[PDB]
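#struct-help
A.M.: can someone run this one for me? Single chain, 129 residues.
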Amino acid sequence: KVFGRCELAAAMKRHGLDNYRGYSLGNWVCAAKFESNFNTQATNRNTDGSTDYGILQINSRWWCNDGRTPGSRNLCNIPCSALLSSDITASVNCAKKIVSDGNGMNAWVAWRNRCKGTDVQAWIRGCRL
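D.P.: on it. Structure tokens below:
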């Protein structure tokens, strides 16, 4: 599923991301926009044997188990395929985990590179919430 920003905002907001650990909704939408272009099925298979899964391109080395990544910690305790669901819940939950595991949204390189220091409210602006 490729979300629209407002639909992803709404979903992320229903999932409590707004202000989750001080990161406004826009941050998360923006992260998703630049990690995955809101594509829940986004995968980036890396040369380091890890893969980035889902709308938030969560990486399989630490966060989810795709079985094929050296050094798997699966700290979100989910198969990585669960991050490729059309529903964002797993990704959200794992994203929350990532932040709860003492990583800011800097954990998302797309967030750091494309959202950090930007008008992330732009990503939820004009949305029904």
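A.M.: thanks! The chain is about 30% helix and 5% strand.
D.P.: also worth noting: The longest helix spans residues 25-36.
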